[PDB]
Amino acid sequence: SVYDAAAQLTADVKKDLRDSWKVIGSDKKGNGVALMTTLFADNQETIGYFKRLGNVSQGMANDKLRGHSITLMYALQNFIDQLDNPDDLVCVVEKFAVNHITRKISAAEFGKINGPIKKVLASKNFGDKYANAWAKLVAVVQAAL
Amino acid sequence: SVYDAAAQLTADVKKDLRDSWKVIGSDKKGNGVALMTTLFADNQETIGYFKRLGNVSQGMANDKLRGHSITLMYALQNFIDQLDNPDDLVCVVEKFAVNHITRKISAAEFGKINGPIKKVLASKNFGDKYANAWAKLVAVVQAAL
Ligand code: HEM
Ligand code: HEM
């Protein structure tokens, strides 16, 4: 159950999550766009799922693309603000889960964001330790899918 | 025009939005739910627009309500973090506007949030001045609908 996954995150994991976010979270626009671009380069099989953002090949030049990147970056903020409160975290996750459930975004498909995240983290000098911690947070969302 | 409305966010209004947000921003969950409850009490003809939310009359108790309440509060935060860059502000508003357009929410309906906000602000000791400043920000989204 979602609650089980949320209550999982330990003090160590929660600490590493906030520690890294403090950086990658400082530039949601610059960092958010990078994550989206990376996911499009490594996972070209997900480009059609964003036919709304038009030509994701534009990057920062794409108005729609930027909107999603910036908006997506904020989505993570909400999860990073409800780490000390499983009750709240679950409610927040379940909400965002609805939008993903209607988009036919299976748990496996959602796990595709792990590749890009790890890259964006390494670019800042965040070894796996941090990459693994982020994976745990992502799992919480998959549990609701 | 979105570009026109956003151009109404002078330095004075920008400062007022941040000065107030700092307070109401401290409690997105507590304040978020309050805004929703006040909106459902002052505007009953807007309850059917949240069928998925289930029983709103439940208040904080309702998990679905809190989830959308906390998430909604974050939406405002994103808009405040873009007050510096008009270009980015629009890209964010347009993105959120698309969600209201597909929901059948016209400028009129949306504008139904000015009442609650004004009430929530007063409870914190923020007269009109602040209530009006927020109206300008809300207007930007109203022009994208
Ligand atoms: C860190 C992980 C992720 C976060 C925080 C996230 C967050 C978001 C948010 C906040 C939205 C807007 C929801 C709406 O307004 O309906 C969204 C939309 C969307 N996301 Fe998830 N997402 C993530 C991963 C993914 C992945 C891995 C995929 C696909 C493989 C995906 C596919 C989509 C699509 C297709 C949309 C709709 C875009 C549009 O048409 O506006 N996302 N995402
Ligand atoms: C400050 C003003 C508001 C903000 C920042 C805001 C923000 C949000 C956000 C971020 C969402 C989630 C979008 C998604 O995942 O699709 C949402 C959903 C929604 N909003 Fe707006 N909203 C505002 C005012 C209103 C008003 C006044 C109405 C109706 C009169 C409204 C109707 C809805 C509905 C029906 C949903 C979908 C709820 C659900 O089924 O989960 N919103 N809002």
Side-chain angles (χ1 to χ4, degrees):
Chain A
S1 91
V2 185
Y3 192 75
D4 286 333
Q8 102 85 281
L9 319 170
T10 67
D12 314 312
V13 164
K14 295 187 181 179
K15 166 83 162 131
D16 293 321
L17 276 174
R18 281 162 168 144
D19 270 352
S20 42
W21 190 243
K22 259 204 229 141
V23 183
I24 82 163
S26 61
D27 206 9
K28 324 179 144 76
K29 160 153 103 159
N31 274 331
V33 167
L35 231 185
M36 285 307 294
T37 50
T38 307
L39 177 75
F40 288 149
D42 299 356
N43 298 97
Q44 314 104 312
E45 79 268 5
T46 75
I47 286 171
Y49 287 136
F50 294 78
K51 104 192 135 72
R52 188 188 87 62
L53 280 195
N55 196 37
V56 301
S57 94
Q58 310 265 189
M60 188 89 29
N62 190 322
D63 63 330
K64 299 210 176 33
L65 189 48
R66 208 154 67 252
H68 174 78
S69 301
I70 288 177
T71 291
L72 183 156
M73 266 331 252
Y74 272 97
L76 286 184
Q77 188 80 52
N78 207 335
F79 303 164
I80 293 296
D81 282 356
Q82 335 292 338
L83 283 182
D84 282 336
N85 198 323
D87 283 314
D88 276 350
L89 189 48
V90 174
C91 100
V92 319
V93 166
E94 283 198 331
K95 179 286 190 288
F96 271 122
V98 159
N99 325 123
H100 281 87
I101 288 166
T102 71
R103 256 97 167 220
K104 297 328 322 189
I105 322 292
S106 77
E109 310 154 79
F110 190 88
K112 274 178 193 175
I113 199 71
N114 273 326
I117 293 195
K118 171 163 197 166
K119 273 168 194 222
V120 165
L121 279 166
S123 74
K124 273 339 175 297
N125 282 138
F126 285 117
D128 302 324
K129 202 199 140 223
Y130 293 96
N132 277 172
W134 270 105
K136 288 157 193 298
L137 180 58
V138 159
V140 179
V141 177
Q142 287 173 301
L145 301 169
Chain B
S1 146
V2 47
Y3 328 65
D4 274 347
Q8 298 288 101
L9 299 190
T10 55
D12 285 338
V13 167
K14 280 206 262 189
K15 189 96 154 83
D16 283 0
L17 292 163
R18 300 190 207 245
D19 269 359
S20 52
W21 185 238
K22 185 198 271 214
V23 172
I24 73 166
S26 65
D27 201 37
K28 329 175 143 28
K29 172 155 89 154
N31 283 338
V33 170
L35 286 194
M36 292 307 317
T37 42
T38 309
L39 161 69
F40 292 141
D42 280 15
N43 298 89
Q44 263 184 182
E45 79 284 1
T46 82
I47 292 167
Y49 277 136
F50 311 81
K51 217 151 292 159
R52 196 194 68 79
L53 287 206
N55 196 11
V56 284
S57 97
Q58 260 161 228
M60 183 81 66
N62 189 316
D63 288 346
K64 285 206 163 43
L65 186 46
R66 208 166 64 253
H68 149 104
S69 286
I70 281 178
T71 300
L72 185 165
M73 277 312 257
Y74 272 100
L76 294 176
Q77 174 79 58
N78 176 2
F79 289 167
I80 300 280
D81 285 353
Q82 313 313 338
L83 287 174
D84 276 322
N85 191 330
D87 276 289
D88 292 326
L89 174 52
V90 173
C91 95
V92 306
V93 158
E94 293 204 329
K95 180 284 183 291
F96 272 120
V98 149
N99 314 104
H100 287 57
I101 283 157
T102 60
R103 254 82 177 229
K104 286 313 253 138
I105 302 297
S106 76
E109 299 270 48
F110 203 91
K112 271 183 188 180
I113 201 58
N114 274 147
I117 298 179
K118 170 126 109 111
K119 263 155 199 212
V120 170
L121 276 172
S123 94
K124 314 328 265 217
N125 224 342
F126 285 81
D128 303 15
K129 173 166 145 192
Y130 293 107
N132 291 140
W134 278 102
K136 304 229 178 215
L137 175 45
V138 168
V140 186
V141 181
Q142 261 185 307
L145 301 171

